[PDB]
Ligand binder design. Structure first.
Ligand code: HEM
Ligand SMILES: CC[C@H](C)C(=O)O[C@H]1CCC=C2C=C[C@H](C)[C@H](CC[C@@H]3C[C@@H](O)CC(=O)O3)[C@H]21
Length: 386
């Protein structure tokens, strides 16, 4: 049984850990609590774990990949960790708000937010840390506007959300962060009950019978995911593009954002993971009832059975959309259309405004989020011809 692989090679910051990609498709894995379950690296096996009803996401059934659990049986509205049919009730309500119209109507504000941060970079002049100047705040402001949350408290949010998604923090640190967020959002929900708005949280209040508790947990989940996904793509994607400069000319390819998603696979440590409810055969192996199965997405997204030249970033490839960067099945990313728009706008406008963008330090000095559940760069010093 192996331990979940963890170390990226020096000089190969975008590629999965060597100890992950060396593995067979389905391997025995030792969990922190002694459970011997499984780690899956092939795309076909990952697909089955993500879509097959014999697998559960309930914490009662799962041995944790990481000991420290950021969660409040799942509390009402904490839909991430539920199975169908309880999950279905919340999922459906949220699909009915992540609509075509809501995202269409948001796009001009995402354009303005992005352009404003680019203007601020131009005023500052080079160098800047792209993480603080652009990658963090643009999607932070977008998610705040989506939810009706005040961006004036973003520094507070960002600090708590980083704890929430860490794999490096104590149970007390994570319980503390969750508490500070819960209390903050609970009050916001109480306020919004009195004064209708058309943002996503205000629409959930108007259109559904969700309780204040349910609304608070939904909002907390969305607020965390909005602060810890897109920002990491913008930062690590920019780094990848600077390191593969011939791909910049391919940024308008229709599937370019999809290729960055596949290549970088920021949900990088043993997620999704699921418990077998019955015995299940996968690749060589017999998964037993009660076994937890973790997926190594980064390896899944480099499967040579699925992708041409899998270890090359190629924004104009024809097979990017087989990637599993957003998961699959009933828990597949709820925010994927929003994230897609934010990324397209973010990357295109950054390089259109600063075509001479370059790293302001050696590549080897960029520090990476190896100890977060969402992979990315902690900082990205950049410069350009002013
Ligand atoms: C930017 C890139 C993003 C990536 C790579 C990403 C990735 C993922 C993945 C892999 C999952 C599945 C987890 C699992 O099955 O265990 C997931 C679920 C989810 N994501 Fe995203 N995500 C991104 C952006 C976002 C954004 C912007 C939001 C906005 C709220 C969001 C909200 C969610 C939600 C709520 C779930 C849980 C769905 C459920 O359990 O029904 N994601 N995402
Ligand atoms: C709990 C945070 C949030 C509500 C959530 O579930 O986000 C989930 C679902 C929505 C988006 C996510 C983006 C990044 C990471 C993978 C998180 C899950 C993070 C947790 C952190 C620790 O508990 C260790 C575990 O490996 O992954 C994921």
């Amino acid at each position: 049984p192996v331990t979940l692989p963890t170390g990226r090679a020096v000089g190969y910051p975008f590629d999965p850990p060597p100890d992950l990609v060396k593995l067979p498709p389905v391997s025995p894995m030792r969990f922190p609590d002694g459970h011997i379950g499984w780690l899956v690296t092939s795309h076909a096996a990952a697909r089955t774990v993500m879509i097959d009803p014999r697998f559960s996401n309930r914490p009662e059934h799962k041995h944790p990949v990481f000991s420290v659990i950021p969660r409040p049986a799942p509390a009402p509205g904490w839909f991430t960790n539920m199975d169908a049919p309880e999950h279905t009730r919340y999922r459906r309500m949220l699909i009915s708000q992540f609509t075509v119209r809501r995202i269409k109507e948001l796009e001009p504000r995402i354009v303005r937010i992005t352009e404003d941060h680019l203007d601020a970079m131009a005023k500052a002049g080079p160098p800047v840390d792209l993480v603080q100047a652009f990658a963090l705040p643009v999607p932070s402001l977008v998610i705040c506007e989506l939810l009706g949350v005040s961006y004036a408290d973003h520094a507070f949010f960002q600090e708590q959300t980083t704890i929430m998604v860490s794999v490096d923090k104590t149970q007390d640190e994570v319980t503390t962060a969750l508490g500070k967020l819960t209390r903050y959002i609970a009050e916001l929900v109480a306020t919004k009950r009195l004064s209708p708005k058309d943002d996503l949280l205000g629409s959930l209040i108007t259109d559904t019978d969700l309780t204040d508790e349910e609304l608070t947990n939904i909002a907390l989940i969305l607020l965390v995911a909005g602060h810890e996904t897109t920002a990491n793509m913008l930062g690590l994607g920019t780094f990848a593009l600077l390191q593969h400069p011939e791909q910049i000319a391919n940024l308008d390819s229709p599937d370019a954002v999809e290729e960055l998603l596949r290549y970088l696979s920021i949900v990088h440590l043993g997620t999704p993971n699921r418990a077998a409810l019955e015995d299940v055969e996968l690749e060589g192996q017999m998964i037993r009832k009660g076994d937890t199965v973790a997926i190594g997405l980064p390896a899944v997204n480099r499967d040579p059975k699925v992708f041409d030249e899998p270890d090359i970033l190629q924004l104009d490839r024809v097979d990017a959309r087989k990637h599993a960067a957003f998961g699959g099945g009933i828990h597949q990313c709820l925010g994927q259309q929003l994230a897609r728009v934010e990324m397209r706008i973010g990357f295109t406008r950054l390089f259109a405004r600063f075509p001479s963008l370059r790293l302001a330090v050696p590549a080897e000095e960029i520090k990476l989020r190896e100890k977060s559940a969402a992979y990315g760069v902690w900082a990205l010093p950049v410069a350009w011809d002013a």
